[PDB]
Amino acid sequence: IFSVDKVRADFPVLSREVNGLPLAYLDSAASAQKPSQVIDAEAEFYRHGYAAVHRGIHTLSAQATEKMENVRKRASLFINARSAEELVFVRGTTEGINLVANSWGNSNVRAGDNIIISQMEHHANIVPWQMLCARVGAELRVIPLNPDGTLQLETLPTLFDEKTRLLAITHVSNVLGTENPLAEMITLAHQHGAKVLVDGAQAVMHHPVDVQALDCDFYVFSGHKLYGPTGIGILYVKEALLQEMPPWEGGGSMIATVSLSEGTTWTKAPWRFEAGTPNTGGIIGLGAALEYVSALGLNNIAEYEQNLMHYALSQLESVPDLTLYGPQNRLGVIAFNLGKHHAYDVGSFLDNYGIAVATGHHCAMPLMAYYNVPAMCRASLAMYNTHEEVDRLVTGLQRIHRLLG
Amino acid sequence: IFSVDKVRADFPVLSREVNGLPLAYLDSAASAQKPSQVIDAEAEFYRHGYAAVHRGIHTLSAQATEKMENVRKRASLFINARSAEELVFVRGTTEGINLVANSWGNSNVRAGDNIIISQMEHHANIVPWQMLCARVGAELRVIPLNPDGTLQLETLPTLFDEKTRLLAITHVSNVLGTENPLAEMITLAHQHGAKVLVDGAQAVMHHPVDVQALDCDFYVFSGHKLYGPTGIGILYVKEALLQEMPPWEGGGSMIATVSLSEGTTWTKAPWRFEAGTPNTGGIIGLGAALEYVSALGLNNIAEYEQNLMHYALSQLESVPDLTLYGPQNRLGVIAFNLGKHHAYDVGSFLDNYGIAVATGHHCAMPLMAYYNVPAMCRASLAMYNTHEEVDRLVTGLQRIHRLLG
Numbered sequence: 001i002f003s004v005d006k007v008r009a010d011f012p013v014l015s016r017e018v019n020g021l022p023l024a025y026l027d028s029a030a031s032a033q034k035p036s037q038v039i040d041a042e043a044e045f046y047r048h049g050y051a052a053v054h055r056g057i058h059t060l061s062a063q064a065t066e067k068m069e070n071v072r073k074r075a076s077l078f079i080n081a082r083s084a085e086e087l088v089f090v091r092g093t094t095e096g097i098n099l100v101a102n103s104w105g106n107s108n109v110r111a112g113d114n115i116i117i118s119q120m121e122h123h124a125n126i127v128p129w130q131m132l133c134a135r136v137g138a139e140l141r142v143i144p145l146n147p148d149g150t151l152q153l154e155t156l157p158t159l160f161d162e163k164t165r166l167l168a169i170t171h172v173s174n175v176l177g178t179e180n181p182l183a184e185m186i187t188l189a190h191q192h193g194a195k196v197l198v199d200g201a202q203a204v205m206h207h208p209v210d211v212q213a214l215d216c217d218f219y220v221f222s223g224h225k226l227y228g229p230t231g232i233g234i235l236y237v238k239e240a241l242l243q244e245m246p247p248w249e250g251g252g253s254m255i256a257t258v259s260l261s262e263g264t265t266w267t268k269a270p271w272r273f274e275a276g277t278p279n280t281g282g283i284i285g286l287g288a289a290l291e292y293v294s295a296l297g298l299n300n301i302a303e304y305e306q307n308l309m310h311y312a313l314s315q316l317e318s319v320p321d322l323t324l325y326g327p328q329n330r331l332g333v334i335a336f337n338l339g340k341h342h343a344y345d346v347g348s349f350l351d352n353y354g355i356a357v358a359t360g361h362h363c364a365m366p367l368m369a370y371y372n373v374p375a376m377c378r379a380s381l382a383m384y385n386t387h388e389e390v391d392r393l394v395t396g397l398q399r400i401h402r403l404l405g
Numbered sequence: 406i407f408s409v410d411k412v413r414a415d416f417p418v419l420s421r422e423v424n425g426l427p428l429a430y431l432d433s434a435a436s437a438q439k440p441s442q443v444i445d446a447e448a449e450f451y452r453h454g455y456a457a458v459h460r461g462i463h464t465l466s467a468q469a470t471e472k473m474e475n476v477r478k479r480a481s482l483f484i485n486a487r488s489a490e491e492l493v494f495v496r497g498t499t500e501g502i503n504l505v506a507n508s509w510g511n512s513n514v515r516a517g518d519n520i521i522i523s524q525m526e527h528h529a530n531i532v533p534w535q536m537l538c539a540r541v542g543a544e545l546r547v548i549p550l551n552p553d554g555t556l557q558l559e560t561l562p563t564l565f566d567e568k569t570r571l572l573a574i575t576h577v578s579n580v581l582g583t584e585n586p587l588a589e590m591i592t593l594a595h596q597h598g599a600k601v602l603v604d605g606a607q608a609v610m611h612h613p614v615d616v617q618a619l620d621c622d623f624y625v626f627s628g629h630k631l632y633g634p635t636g637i638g639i640l641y642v643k644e645a646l647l648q649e650m651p652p653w654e655g656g657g658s659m660i661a662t663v664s665l666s667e668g669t670t671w672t673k674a675p676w677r678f679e680a681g682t683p684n685t686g687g688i689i690g691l692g693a694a695l696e697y698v699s700a701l702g703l704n705n706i707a708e709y710e711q712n713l714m715h716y717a718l719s720q721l722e723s724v725p726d727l728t729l730y731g732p733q734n735r736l737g738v739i740a741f742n743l744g745k746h747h748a749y750d751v752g753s754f755l756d757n758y759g760i761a762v763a764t765g766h767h768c769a770m771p772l773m774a775y776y777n778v779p780a781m782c783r784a785s786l787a788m789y790n791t792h793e794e795v796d797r798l799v800t801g802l803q804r805i806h807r808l809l810g
């Protein structure tokens with residue numbers, strides 16, 4: 001079983017006070033807090049083992065290089081990639097999507113082709129493909145939404161055709177909490193010889209993830225939402241695709257040879273896509289993050305979070321004029337608006353109670369447009385959140401409605 | 406005055422033992438050690454103040470956003486940029502050069518144009534321009550070297566012409582320690598209407614740097630060589646150039662509006678070049694790094710390092726068959742080879758004494774080719790290094806020559 005009290009004891013931020021009152025951090029979907037196991041792992045690496053990696057033969061450099069590639073191996077096992085050489089270190093989901101869109105997109109998407117995204121995508125999974133479609137002269141098609149925050153799956157027959165090069169789709173919606181039927185969609189996209197990039201930024205922290213079972217071609221997530229440091233993320237690519245992709249960033253540690261008269265040659269995959277000094281501090285911290293999350297066990301986290309989510313949805317039923325967005329089985333987040341009050345105002349009042357929720361468009365303006373609102377509130381319910389905090393959210397919304405209605 | 410003993414007391418790694426023996430870290434040019442002021446600043450941010458930045462109205466998010474943009478202001482003052490809005494956060498020198506090469510290069514370098522780099526450049530300042538010249542059909546010209554590791558400045562008349570769009574030049578050579586006459590070269594390049602990108606990865610830690618006085622158009626350096634965290638760096642661009650450059654990475658926090666039917670619009674400069682979640686942990690640590698280096702005072706560091714360098718060059722005179730590369734007034738590093746022994750072997754013996762030096766090509770293969778060697782040894786002498794450690798280097802080379810000659 002899961003003991004949220006013991007978990008919270010690992011997170012020094014959770015003892016913080018905001019505005020005189022004790023913090024209720026309900027915004028892990030924007031970024032997650034970090035346990036001192038993660039913070040100290042990075043700190044102790046800087047304190048005792050720091051060196052440049054890959055180049056260099058001295059001891060610290062060799063031991064730091066070992067640490068880095070061990071984290072690549074642990075990450076590849078976390079998402080059940082066949083090989084650690086299928087994982088590329090990136091700054092996060094957004095750089096990972098940009099890397100695919102340039103390295104792979106530019107050499108596999110011709111004028112007259114089409115790419116499919118969905119109306120619920122984060123901006124990280126829209127703007128790169130808009131840029132690619134503009135560069136090559138292709139069309140960006142959109143899987144539309146149902147009122148309940150699920151995909152209109154019946155539109156796929158009209159979006160997919162022989163010219164469909166790529167489907168880029170989210171695993172879990174950072175706003176609605178919808179989880180998309182990735183296995184079956186990837187089957188369909190593969191029947192047309194299309195690849196699938198999966199945005200898994202909001203999945204990898206809520207339940208186990210198996211990229212061999214999904215058969216996705218690319219998968220991306222971010223360290224800082226997995227209870228880890230900022231400035232680090234993972235891009236997974238099928239070995240056969242990755243070996244064919246050209247470099248994106250150029251510089252040191254991705255060349256084989258540099259000549260000013262006979263040109264330059266690239267090293268083999270993963271390392272060909274990693275230019276300059278890696279974020280070694282971030283990688284070490286991400287590795288601790290994977291160790292920490294695996295020790296609690298994702299299936300235990302999934303259960304605790306599923307029960308907290310149920311408790312919340314049940315309690316919110318007693319908030320007047322509350323509008324929820326998204327499906328009943330949402331993961332991680334609750335998207336809502338309070339009567340006719342603007343979300344910015346509702347969020348301000350909740351922050352005044354010391355409750356941190358997200359407000360605005362959540363880098364998903366097309367989703368806001370579909371629901372014909374400018375903004376929503378989003379509350380995250382993560383493995384370190386409590387029924388007590390759910391109650392403070394509910395009371396607070398009640399008080400806001402009384403005060404402002 | 407400078408007190409290297411008190412400085413070293415800030416650096417927990419310097420107490421490390423390697424191979425049973427006490428560490429002599431002579432490889433800060435590859436990456437620098439970090440003081441606990443830097444390590445703890447990042448750690449305390451994760452521990453007490455962590456949130457997502459820019460989006461969000463709650464307290465932690467607003468205070469984290471303040472911290473981030475204050476570091477942008479402190480960085481802009483460190484290099485004497487006119488405006489903090491002229492600085493872009495990047496992963497380091499290599500991403501910063503790639504950003505200019507794509508965002509600015511692709512829209513200002515046409516087929517038939519030429520770009521000038523130098524033979525002493527790091528790979529970060531070669532491979533991006535080779536990629537750009539291949540994309541657009543331009544020519545990469547090279548300022549050649551003199552035997553002493555300085556530029557053959559008399560070749561500039563034949564390299565510069567009306568078609569010269571850009572000079573990309575290093576401030577200090579990561580290998581030879583040469584410092585290039587940037588002020589005068591930028592004058593010349595500006596007379597032809599060419600812009601200058603300066604690679605300052607090896608300058609900003611050795612003496613003050615003033616981008617208004619240099620009149621450079623772009624400048625780049627890396628956090629981890631400035632006694633700071635990995636995964637963070639600064640790209641400086643003149644306000645007028647930066648406002649004209651198009652985005653590079655696309656995603657959240659660089660849009661103004663995202664529409665799936667009317668396209669997307671970009672936000673204003675700096676922020677248009679920063680997609681997704683920033684490396685907030687890195688930025689906080691870089692900010693502490695700038696605070697720490699400014700407290701010692703760059704001119705004090707420059708003096709201590711200049712005297713240590715003189716002491717070393719003087720002592721190395723008593724090493725038989727030692728070949729040095731580079732000018733007499735080198736900054737930061739000493740590049741050498743021991744008799745006919747391969748640098749990898751010499752570095753292995755020094756690491757066995759617990760002395761960490763760099764060996765190989767130092768991501769500067771064209772420089773190795775000019776000196777008709779495959780590799781060199783490089784020893785860094787930074788503000789926390791001692792005359793005692795110089796002696797261990799000298800003794801060690803002597804012992805290596807006796808043993809292996």
Ligand SMILES: [Cl-]
Nearest residue numbers: 252253528768
């Ligand atoms: Cl290299």
Ligand SMILES: [Cl-]
Nearest residue numbers: 123363657658
């Ligand atoms: Cl956005």
